[PDB]
Design a binder for this molecule. Structure first.
Ligand code: FOF
Length: 290
């Protein structure tokens, strides 16, 4: 069904070993509520997803990305099941520990896992480790659920997805995993390219998550289908066209930045290529999933 795409996804070469490694660590430390929970956890294959998003990550770093994303999803699920206040408190306890300004309980996995993870990351590359720090707090604090809902125009919806705090985290993490060292200016001039990516990432997600999200809704599939009065299949076909169109915008922006007179850094190029993999990898994942 999906129209052709100029891009080829890629999975990190060490996906298998790393997946065992990381999943194992959590089977060893996280206090799972039950065995069914463990089954659910494993079926998520967090390390595999991470490996599809960051296939160009350095071999000795890819596991950090897997670890960080895994605990963040575990945490995200926890916050979703506790009152806004309790949730807010939960993060208040972890962020200070994540910074390393507070020792972990050591009896509370949510505490020592984050603590040991950030300490090992900072020990490996403090400069870039810190680059990922604030983005993950923003992401964590955004998980305290309240309000949120009702967007009916395409524009507003796409604009809202461009600002997604998680896709922002992904990009920061991507830099750390690949060991990319960019300048403030370089990073700023990447905004547009980044927004286009965050937007593409969301729509492809919606297209594949629409059906399952049916039971009783912030989705591009719903928004457009209403505005255009088309059926779901048609809407999806249209969303795909737009998706492939945005991939061209990506390529166009890249080519332009590279061929630019002011030149394009080696680290900059790696960064842009990296974003392409998040998108190609995100789709690959989205097809074959759940
Ligand atoms: C962005 C994060 C935290 C993980 C990768 C998988 C993913 C995109 C999950 C949520 C789906 C979503 C909100 C898509 C945007 O429409």
């Amino acid at each position: 069904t999906p129209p052709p795409t100029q891009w080829s996804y890629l999975c990190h070469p060490r996906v298998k070993e790393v997946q065992d490694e990381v999943d194992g660590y959590f089977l060893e430390n996280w206090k799972f509520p039950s065995f069914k929970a463990v089954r659910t956890f494993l079926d998520a294959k967090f390390s595999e997803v991470t490996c599809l998003y960051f296939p160009l990550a350095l071999d000795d770093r890819i596991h950090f990305a897997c670890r960080l994303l895994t605990v963040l999803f575990l945490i995200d699920d926890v916050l979703e099941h506790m009152s806004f206040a309790d949730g807010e408190a939960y993060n208040n306890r972890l962020i200070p520990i994540s910074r390393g300004d507070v020792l972990p309980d050591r009896t509370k996995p949510e505490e020592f896992i984050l603590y040991d993870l950030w300490e090992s990351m900072r020990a490996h590359d403090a400069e870039l480790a810190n680059e990922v720090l604030e983005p993950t707090f923003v992401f964590m604090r955004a998980q305290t659920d309240r309000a949120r809902l009702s967007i009916h125009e395409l524009g507003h919806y796409l604009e809202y997805r461009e600002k997604d705090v998680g896709k922002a985290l992904l990009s920061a993490l991507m830099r750390f995993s690949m060991g990319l060292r960019l300048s403030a200016d370089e990073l700023q001039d990447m905004k547009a390219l980044e927004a286009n990516c965050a937007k593409q990432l969301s729509v492809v997600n919606d297209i594949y998550s629409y059906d399952k999200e049916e039971e009783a809704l912030c989705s591009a599939v719903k928004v457009l289908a209403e505005e255009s009065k088309l059926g779901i299949p048609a809407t999806k076909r249209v969303l795909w066209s737009m998706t492939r169109e945005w991939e061209t915008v990506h390529d166009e922006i890249v080519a332009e930045k590279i061929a630019s007179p002011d030149g394009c850094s080696e680290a900059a190029k790696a960064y842009m290529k990296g974003l392409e993999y998040q998108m190609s990898g995100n789709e690959q994942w989205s097809k074959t999933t759940r």
